[PDB]
Coordinates of C-alpha atoms and ligand atoms in Angstrom, one line a residue:
Chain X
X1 CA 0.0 0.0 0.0
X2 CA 1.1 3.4 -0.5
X3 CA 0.3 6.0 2.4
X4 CA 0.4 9.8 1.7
X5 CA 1.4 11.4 4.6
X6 CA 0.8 15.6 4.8
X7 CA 2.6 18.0 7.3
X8 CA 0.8 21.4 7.5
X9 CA 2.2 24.8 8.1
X10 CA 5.0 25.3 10.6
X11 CA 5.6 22.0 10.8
X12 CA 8.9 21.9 8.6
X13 CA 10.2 24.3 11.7
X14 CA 10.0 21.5 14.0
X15 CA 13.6 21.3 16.2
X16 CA 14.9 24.9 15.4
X17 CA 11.8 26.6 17.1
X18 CA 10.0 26.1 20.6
X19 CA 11.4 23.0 23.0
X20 CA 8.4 23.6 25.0
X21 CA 5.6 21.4 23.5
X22 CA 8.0 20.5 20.4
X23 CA 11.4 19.0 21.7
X24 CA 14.4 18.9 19.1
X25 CA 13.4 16.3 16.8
X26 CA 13.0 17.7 13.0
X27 CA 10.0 17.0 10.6
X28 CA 12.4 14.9 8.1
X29 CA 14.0 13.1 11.6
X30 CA 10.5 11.7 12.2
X31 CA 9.9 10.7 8.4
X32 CA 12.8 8.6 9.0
X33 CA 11.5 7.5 12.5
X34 CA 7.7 6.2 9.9
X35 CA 9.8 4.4 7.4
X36 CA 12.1 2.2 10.0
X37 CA 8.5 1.3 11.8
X38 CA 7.5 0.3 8.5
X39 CA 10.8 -1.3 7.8
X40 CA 10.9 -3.3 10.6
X41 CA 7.4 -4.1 11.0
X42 CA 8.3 -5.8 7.7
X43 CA 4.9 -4.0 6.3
X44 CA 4.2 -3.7 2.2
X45 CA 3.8 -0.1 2.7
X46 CA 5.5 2.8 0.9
X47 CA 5.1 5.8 2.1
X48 CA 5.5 9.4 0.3
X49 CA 5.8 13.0 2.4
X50 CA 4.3 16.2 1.7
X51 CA 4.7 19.6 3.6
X52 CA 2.9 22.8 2.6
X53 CA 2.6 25.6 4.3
X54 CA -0.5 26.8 1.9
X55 CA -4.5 25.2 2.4
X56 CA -4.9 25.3 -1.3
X57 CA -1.4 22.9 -2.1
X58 CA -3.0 20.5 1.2
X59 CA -6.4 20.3 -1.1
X60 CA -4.7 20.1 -4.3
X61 CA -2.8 17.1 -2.4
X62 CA -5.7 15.3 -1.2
X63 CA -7.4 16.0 -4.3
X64 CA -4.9 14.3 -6.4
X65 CA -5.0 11.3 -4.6
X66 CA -8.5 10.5 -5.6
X67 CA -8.2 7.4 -7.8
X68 CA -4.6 7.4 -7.4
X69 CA -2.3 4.6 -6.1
X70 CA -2.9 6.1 -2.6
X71 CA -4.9 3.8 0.0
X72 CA -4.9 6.4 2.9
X73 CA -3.8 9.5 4.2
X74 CA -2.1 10.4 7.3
X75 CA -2.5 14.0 8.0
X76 CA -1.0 17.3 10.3
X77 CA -3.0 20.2 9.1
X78 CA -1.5 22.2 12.1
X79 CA -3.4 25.4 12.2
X80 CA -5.3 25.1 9.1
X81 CA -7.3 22.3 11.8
X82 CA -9.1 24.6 13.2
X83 CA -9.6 27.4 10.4
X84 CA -10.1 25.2 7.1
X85 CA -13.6 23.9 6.2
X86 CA -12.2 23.8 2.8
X87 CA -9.5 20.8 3.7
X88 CA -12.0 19.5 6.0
X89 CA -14.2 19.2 2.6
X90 CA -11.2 17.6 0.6
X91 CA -11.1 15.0 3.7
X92 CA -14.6 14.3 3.4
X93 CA -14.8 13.6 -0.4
X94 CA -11.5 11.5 -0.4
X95 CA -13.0 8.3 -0.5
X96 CA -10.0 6.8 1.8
X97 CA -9.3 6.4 5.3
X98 CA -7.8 9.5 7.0
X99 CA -6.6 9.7 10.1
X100 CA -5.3 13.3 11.6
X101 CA -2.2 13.6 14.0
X102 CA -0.9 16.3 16.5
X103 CA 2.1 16.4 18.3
X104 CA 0.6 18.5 20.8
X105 CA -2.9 18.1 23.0
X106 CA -5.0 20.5 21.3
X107 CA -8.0 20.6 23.9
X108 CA -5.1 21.5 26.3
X109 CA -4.0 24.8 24.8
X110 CA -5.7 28.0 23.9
X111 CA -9.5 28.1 23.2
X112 CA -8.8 28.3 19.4
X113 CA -6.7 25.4 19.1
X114 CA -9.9 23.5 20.0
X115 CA -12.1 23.5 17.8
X116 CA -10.6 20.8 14.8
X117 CA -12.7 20.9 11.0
X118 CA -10.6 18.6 9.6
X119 CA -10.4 16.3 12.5
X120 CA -13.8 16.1 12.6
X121 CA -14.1 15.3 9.0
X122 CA -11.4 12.2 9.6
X123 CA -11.7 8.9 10.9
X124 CA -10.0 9.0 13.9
X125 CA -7.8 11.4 15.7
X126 CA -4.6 11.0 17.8
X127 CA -2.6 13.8 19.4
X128 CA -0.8 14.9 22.5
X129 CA 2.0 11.6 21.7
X130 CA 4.6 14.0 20.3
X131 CA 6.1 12.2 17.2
X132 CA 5.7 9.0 18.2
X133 CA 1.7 9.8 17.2
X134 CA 2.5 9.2 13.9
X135 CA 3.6 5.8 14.6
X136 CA 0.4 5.5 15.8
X137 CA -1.6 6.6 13.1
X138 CA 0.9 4.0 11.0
X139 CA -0.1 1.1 12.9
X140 CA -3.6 2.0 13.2
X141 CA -4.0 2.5 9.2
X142 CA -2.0 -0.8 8.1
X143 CA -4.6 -2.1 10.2
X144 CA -7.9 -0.1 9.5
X145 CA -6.2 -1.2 5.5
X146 CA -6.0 -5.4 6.4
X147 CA -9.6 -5.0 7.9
X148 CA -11.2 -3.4 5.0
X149 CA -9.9 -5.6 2.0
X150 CA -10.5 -8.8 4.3
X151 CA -13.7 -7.5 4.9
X152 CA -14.7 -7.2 0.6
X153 CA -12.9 -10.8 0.8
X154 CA -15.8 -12.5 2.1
X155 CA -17.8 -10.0 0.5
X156 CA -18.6 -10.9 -3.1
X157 CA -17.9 -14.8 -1.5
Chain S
X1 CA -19.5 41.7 -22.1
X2 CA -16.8 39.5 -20.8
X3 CA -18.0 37.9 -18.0
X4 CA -15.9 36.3 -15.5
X5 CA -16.6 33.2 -13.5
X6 CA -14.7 32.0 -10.6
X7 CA -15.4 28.5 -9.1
X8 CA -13.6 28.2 -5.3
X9 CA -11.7 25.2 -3.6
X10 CA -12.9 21.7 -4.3
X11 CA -15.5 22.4 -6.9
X12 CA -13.7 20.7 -9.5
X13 CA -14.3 17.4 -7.6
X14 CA -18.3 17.9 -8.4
X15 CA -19.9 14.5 -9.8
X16 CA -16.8 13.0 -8.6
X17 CA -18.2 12.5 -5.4
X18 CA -21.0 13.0 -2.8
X19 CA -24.3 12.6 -4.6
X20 CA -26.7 14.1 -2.3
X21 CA -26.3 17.7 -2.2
X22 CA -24.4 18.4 -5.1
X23 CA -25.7 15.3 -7.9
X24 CA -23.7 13.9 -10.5
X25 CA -23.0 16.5 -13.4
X26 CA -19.3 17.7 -13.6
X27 CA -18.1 21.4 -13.8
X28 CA -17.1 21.3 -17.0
X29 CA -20.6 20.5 -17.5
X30 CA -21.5 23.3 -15.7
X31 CA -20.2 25.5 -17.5
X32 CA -21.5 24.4 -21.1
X33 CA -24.4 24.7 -19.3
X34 CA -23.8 27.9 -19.3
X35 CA -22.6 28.5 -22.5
X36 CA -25.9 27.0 -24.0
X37 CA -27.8 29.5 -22.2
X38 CA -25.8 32.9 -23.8
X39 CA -26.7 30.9 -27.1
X40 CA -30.6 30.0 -26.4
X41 CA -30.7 33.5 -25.2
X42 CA -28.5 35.2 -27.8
X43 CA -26.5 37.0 -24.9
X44 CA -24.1 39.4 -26.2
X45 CA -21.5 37.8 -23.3
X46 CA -18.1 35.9 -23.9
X47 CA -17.4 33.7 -20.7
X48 CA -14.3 33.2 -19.2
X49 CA -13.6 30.2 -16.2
X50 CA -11.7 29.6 -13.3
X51 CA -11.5 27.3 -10.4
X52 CA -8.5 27.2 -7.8
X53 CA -8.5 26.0 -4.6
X54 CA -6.3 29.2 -3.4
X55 CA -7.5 32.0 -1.4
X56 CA -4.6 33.9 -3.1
X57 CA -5.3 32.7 -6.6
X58 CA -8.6 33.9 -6.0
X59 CA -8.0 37.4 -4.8
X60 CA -5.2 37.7 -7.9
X61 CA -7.7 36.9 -10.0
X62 CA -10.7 39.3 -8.9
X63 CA -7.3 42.2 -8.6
X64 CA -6.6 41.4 -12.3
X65 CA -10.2 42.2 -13.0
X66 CA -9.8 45.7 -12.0
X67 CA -9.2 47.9 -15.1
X68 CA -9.3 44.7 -17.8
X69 CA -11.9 43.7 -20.3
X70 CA -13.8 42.2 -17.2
X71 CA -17.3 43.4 -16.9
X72 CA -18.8 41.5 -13.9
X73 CA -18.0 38.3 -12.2
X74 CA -20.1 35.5 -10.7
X75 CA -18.3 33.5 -8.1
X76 CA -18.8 30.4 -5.6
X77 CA -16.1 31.0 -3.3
X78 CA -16.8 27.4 -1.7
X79 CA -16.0 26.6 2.0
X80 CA -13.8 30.2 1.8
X81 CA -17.7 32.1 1.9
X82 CA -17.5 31.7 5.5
X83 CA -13.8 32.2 6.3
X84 CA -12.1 34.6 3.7
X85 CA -12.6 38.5 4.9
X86 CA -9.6 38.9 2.5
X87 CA -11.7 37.4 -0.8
X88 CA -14.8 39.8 0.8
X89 CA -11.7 42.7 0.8
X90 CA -10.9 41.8 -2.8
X91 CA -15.0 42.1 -3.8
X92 CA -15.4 45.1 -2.3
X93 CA -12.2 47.0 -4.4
X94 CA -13.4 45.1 -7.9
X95 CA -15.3 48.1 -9.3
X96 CA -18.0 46.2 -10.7
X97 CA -20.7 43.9 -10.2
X98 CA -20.2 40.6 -8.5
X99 CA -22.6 37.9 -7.9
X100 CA -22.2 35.1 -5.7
X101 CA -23.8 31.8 -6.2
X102 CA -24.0 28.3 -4.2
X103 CA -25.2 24.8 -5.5
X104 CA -26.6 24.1 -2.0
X105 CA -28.9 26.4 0.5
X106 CA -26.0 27.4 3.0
X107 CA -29.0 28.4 5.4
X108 CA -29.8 24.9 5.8
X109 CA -26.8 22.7 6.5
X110 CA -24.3 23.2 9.5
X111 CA -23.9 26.3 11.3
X112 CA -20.8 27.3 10.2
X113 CA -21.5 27.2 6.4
X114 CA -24.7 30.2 7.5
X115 CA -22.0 33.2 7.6
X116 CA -20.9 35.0 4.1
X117 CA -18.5 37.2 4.2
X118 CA -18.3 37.0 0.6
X119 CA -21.5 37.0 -0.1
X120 CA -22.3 40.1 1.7
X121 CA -19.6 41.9 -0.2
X122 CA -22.0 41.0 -3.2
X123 CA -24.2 42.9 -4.9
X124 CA -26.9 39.7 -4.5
X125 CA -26.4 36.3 -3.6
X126 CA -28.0 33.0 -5.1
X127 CA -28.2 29.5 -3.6
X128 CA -29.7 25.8 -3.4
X129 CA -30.7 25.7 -7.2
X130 CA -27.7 23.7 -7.8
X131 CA -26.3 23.9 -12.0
X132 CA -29.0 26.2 -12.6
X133 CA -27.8 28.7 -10.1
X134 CA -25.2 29.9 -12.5
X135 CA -27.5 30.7 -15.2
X136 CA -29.9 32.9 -13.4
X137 CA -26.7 34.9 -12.6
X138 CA -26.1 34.8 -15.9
X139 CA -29.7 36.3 -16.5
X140 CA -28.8 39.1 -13.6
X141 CA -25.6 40.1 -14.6
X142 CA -26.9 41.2 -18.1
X143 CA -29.5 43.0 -16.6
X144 CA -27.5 44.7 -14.2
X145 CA -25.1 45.8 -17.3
X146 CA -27.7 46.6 -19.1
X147 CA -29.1 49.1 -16.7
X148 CA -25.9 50.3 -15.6
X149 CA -25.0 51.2 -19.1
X150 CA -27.9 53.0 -19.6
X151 CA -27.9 55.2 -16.8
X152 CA -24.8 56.2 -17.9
X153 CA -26.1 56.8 -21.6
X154 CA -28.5 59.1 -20.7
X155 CA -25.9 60.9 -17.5
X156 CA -24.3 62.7 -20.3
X157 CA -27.7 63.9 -22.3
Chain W
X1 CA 20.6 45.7 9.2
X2 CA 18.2 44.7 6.5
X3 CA 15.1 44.7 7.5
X4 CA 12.4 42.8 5.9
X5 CA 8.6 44.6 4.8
X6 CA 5.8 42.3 4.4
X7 CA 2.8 43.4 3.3
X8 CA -0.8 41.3 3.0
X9 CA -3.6 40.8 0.6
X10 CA -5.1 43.4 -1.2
X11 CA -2.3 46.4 -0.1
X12 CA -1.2 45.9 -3.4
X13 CA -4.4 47.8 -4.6
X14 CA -3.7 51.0 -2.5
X15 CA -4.6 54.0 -4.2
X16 CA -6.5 52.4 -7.0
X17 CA -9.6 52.1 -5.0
X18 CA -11.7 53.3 -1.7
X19 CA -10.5 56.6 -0.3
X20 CA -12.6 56.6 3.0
X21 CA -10.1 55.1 5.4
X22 CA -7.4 54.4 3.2
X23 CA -6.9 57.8 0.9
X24 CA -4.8 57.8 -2.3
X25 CA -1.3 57.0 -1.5
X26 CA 0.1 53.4 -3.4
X27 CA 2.0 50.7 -2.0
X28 CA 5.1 51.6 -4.1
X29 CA 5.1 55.1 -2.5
X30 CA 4.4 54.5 0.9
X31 CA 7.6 52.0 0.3
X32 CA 9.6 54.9 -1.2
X33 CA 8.8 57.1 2.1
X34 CA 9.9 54.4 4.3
X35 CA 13.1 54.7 2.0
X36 CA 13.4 58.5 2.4
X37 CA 13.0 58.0 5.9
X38 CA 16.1 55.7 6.3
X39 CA 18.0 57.7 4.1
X40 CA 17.8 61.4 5.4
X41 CA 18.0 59.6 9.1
X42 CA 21.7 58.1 7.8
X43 CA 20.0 54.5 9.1
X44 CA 22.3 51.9 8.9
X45 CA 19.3 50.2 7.4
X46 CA 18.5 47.9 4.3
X47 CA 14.9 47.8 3.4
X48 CA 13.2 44.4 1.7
X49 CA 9.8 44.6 0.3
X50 CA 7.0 41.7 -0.3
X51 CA 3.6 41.9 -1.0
X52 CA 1.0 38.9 -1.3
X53 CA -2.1 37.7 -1.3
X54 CA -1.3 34.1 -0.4
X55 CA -1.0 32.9 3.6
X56 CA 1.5 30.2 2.4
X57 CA 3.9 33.0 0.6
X58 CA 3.6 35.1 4.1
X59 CA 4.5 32.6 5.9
X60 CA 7.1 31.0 3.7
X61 CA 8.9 34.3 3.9
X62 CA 8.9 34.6 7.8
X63 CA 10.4 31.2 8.0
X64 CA 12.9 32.0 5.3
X65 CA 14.5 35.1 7.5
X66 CA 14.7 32.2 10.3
X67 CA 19.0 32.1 10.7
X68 CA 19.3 34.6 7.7
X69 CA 20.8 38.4 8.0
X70 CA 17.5 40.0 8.5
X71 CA 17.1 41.3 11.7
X72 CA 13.8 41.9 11.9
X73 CA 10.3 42.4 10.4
X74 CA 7.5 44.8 9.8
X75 CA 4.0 43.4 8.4
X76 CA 0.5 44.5 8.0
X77 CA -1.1 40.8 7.4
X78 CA -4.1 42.4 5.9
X79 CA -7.5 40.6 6.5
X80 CA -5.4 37.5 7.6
X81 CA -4.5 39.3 11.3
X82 CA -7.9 38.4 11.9
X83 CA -7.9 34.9 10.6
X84 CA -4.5 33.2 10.6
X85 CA -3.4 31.5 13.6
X86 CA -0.6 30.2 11.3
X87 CA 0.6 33.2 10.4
X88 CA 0.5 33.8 14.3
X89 CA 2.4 30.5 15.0
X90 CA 5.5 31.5 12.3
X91 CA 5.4 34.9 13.6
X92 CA 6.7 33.2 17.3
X93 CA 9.5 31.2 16.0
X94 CA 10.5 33.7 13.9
X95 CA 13.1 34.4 16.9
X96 CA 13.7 38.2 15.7
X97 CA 11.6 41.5 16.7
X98 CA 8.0 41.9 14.6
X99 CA 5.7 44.8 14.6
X100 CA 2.4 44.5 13.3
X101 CA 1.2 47.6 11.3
X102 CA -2.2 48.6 9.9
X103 CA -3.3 51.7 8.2
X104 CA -6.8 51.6 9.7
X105 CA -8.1 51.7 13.5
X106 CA -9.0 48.1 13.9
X107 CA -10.7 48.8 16.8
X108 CA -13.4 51.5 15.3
X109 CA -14.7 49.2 12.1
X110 CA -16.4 46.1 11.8
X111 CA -16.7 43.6 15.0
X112 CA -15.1 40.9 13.1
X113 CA -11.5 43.1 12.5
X114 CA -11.0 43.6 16.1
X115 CA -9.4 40.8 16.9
X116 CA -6.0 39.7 15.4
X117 CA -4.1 36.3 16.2
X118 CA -1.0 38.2 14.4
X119 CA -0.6 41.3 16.3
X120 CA -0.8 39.3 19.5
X121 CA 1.8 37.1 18.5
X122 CA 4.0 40.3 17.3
X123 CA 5.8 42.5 20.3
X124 CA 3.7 45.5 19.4
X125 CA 1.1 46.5 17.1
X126 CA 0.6 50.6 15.3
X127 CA -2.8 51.0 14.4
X128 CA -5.0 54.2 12.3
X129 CA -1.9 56.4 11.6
X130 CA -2.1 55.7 7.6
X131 CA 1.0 55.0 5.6
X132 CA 3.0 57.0 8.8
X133 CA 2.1 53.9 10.8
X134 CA 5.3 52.2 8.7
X135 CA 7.6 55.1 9.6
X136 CA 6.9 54.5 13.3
X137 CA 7.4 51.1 12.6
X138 CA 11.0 51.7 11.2
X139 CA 11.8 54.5 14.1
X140 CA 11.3 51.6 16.8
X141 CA 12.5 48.7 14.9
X142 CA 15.8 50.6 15.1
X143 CA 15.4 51.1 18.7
X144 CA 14.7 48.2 19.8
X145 CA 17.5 46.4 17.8
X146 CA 20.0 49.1 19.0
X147 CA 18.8 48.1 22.7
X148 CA 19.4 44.2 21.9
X149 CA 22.5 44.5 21.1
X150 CA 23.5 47.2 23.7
X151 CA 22.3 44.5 26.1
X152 CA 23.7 41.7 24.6
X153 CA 27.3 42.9 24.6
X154 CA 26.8 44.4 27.9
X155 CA 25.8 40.9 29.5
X156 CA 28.8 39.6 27.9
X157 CA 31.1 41.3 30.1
Ligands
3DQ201 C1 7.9 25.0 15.6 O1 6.8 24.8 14.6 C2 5.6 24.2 15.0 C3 4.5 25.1 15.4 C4 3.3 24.5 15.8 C5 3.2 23.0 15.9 C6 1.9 22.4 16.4 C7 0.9 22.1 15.3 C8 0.4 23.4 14.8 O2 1.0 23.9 13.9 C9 -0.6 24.2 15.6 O3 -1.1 25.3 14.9 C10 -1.8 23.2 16.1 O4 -2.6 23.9 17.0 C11 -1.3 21.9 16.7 C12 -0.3 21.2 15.8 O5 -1.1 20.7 14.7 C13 0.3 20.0 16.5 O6 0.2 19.8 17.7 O7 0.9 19.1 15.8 C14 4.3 22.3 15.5 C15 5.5 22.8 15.1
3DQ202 C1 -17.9 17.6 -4.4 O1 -17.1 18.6 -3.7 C2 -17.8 19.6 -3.2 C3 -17.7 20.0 -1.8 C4 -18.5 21.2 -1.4 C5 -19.3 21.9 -2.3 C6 -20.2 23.1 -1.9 C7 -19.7 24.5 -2.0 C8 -18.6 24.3 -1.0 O2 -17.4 24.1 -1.3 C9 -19.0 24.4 0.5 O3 -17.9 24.4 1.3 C10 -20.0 25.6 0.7 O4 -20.4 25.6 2.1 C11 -21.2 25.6 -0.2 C12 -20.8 25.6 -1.7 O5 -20.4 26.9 -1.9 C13 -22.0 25.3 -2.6 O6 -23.1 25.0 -2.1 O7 -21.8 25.5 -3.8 C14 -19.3 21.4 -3.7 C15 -18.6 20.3 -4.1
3DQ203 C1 -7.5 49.2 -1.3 O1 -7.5 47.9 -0.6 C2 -7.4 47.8 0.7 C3 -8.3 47.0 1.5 C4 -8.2 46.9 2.9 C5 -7.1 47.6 3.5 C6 -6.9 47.5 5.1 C7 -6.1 46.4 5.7 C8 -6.9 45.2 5.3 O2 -6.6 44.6 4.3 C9 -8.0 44.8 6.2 O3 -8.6 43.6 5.9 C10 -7.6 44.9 7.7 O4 -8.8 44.7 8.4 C11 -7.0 46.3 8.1 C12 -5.8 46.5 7.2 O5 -4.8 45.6 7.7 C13 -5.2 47.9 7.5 O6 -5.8 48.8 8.1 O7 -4.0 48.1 7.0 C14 -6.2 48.3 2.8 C15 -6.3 48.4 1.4

């Protein structure tokens, strides 16, 4: 399976900016963190990386991978969580599983890191882990992936 | 007339998903629609089309409007109605008429999708017709011209 | 120092539209002031303009100043002060001095331009002075990046 895996804006400043909710770690450091889970896991999955610090390049994105090779998205919108109906919509008509990360604990921060469109719009949700969330969502999609092809197994059967 | 029409974020993915609201016809469909009404109308108005799903591309676009062959634009600024007070910005400096239309009747889904900034930057805002919502803009935007042309005809008399 | 200008959506159109609370005065002039300014004040001081309509570009440019020789930076964010928390986010790593400026009073117009997630994350906002709100902007950017490094040498020793 390939897995598309999008990093919102900011994100590529991880580990030069903010050891206070963000450690050291950088966004490529964790990339390499996904593909050695994968590696070792000994799991058929490749997996391609996208960061964008503009909404309309996260849509376009998401967009693209509609009838594409992709089988699911793992997804960091970072702020554009709790602004953008219009990725939130792009979620909604990808016709994939998506499953939405944060490092941080959103409903532990300000009021307006609440409120999450896109998460809403995704399957599941997973934050406050730091990097090792992403893990996470990696485990949880090979998974959510086995169950839904077994599943149209016994289906036309 | 020239007549401008801009189509917002994830409207290119019409009846490529989510058949409920929105149907199954395409956008370039849409927009022969369209065409076929200046001909069974014989509408002295050449069409130009745009769809982005950028903010920015959007705003450029309505900006390169201003002092061009442009005479009005009809727009569906998509999920960026409710959000983008820069795209309402942009409407309000365009120096011509601008219509805004939506497929579905934003007064009846979620309460976020109620708010238009864009729309009430408008001069008059259509919705929930779906297709055919571009047409009767279409209809108004010739009579605005029309009208605004003619005051001006007879300013100088 | 150079010091880096950024400028929002829809500042580009200064002059050629709405003199009410923005007068007749362009972009390119009010940049040509701030450049007179410098220059009859003998600043040690090289200006960098940018102006955009797109959030990505904004913040794409405050992250590309992170570790360069700009030593600080002036923005009016435009209608996205009172949308973008990611704009707000790159502003706080940017790990230099920023000083949000607007030509209006964003406290005397419409409810929904009163509050603005950039000019809380900047270290001081100038509001309703016009195109001099930029000049003020350069007069303490000096000041406060002559006190820095008074302080910095100083703690030194
Ligand atoms: C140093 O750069 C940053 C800035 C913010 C974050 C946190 C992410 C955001 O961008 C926030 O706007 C959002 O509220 C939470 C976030 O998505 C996360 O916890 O991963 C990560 C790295
Ligand atoms: C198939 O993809 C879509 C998703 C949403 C829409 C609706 C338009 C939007 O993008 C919404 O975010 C908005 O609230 C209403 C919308 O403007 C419309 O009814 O045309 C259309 C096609
Ligand atoms: C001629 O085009 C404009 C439109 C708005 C402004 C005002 C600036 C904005 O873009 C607003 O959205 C914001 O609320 C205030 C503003 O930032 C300012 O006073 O500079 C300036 C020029």
């Amino acid at each position: 399976m390939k897995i598309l895996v999008i990093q919102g804006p900011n994100l590529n400043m991880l580990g030069h900016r903010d050891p206070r909710l963000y450690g050291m770690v950088t966004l490529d450091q964790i990339h390499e963190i996904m593909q050695t889970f994968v590696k070792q896991g000994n799991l058929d999955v490749e997996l391609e990386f996208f960061q964008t610090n503009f909404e309309g390049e996260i849509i376009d994105k998401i967009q693209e991978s509609v009838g594409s090779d992709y089988e699911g998205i793992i997804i960091n919108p970072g702020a554009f969580s709790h602004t953008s109906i219009a990725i939130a919509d792009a979620i909604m008509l990808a016709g994939k599983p998506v499953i939405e990360v944060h490092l941080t604990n959103i409903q532990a921060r300000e009021e307006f890191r609440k409120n999450s469109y896109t998460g809403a719009a995704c399957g599941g949700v997973i934050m406050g882990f730091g990097p090792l969330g992403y893990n996470m969502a990696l485990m949880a999609m090979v998974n959510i992936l086995a169950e839904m092809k077994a599943f149209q197994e016994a289906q036309k059967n």
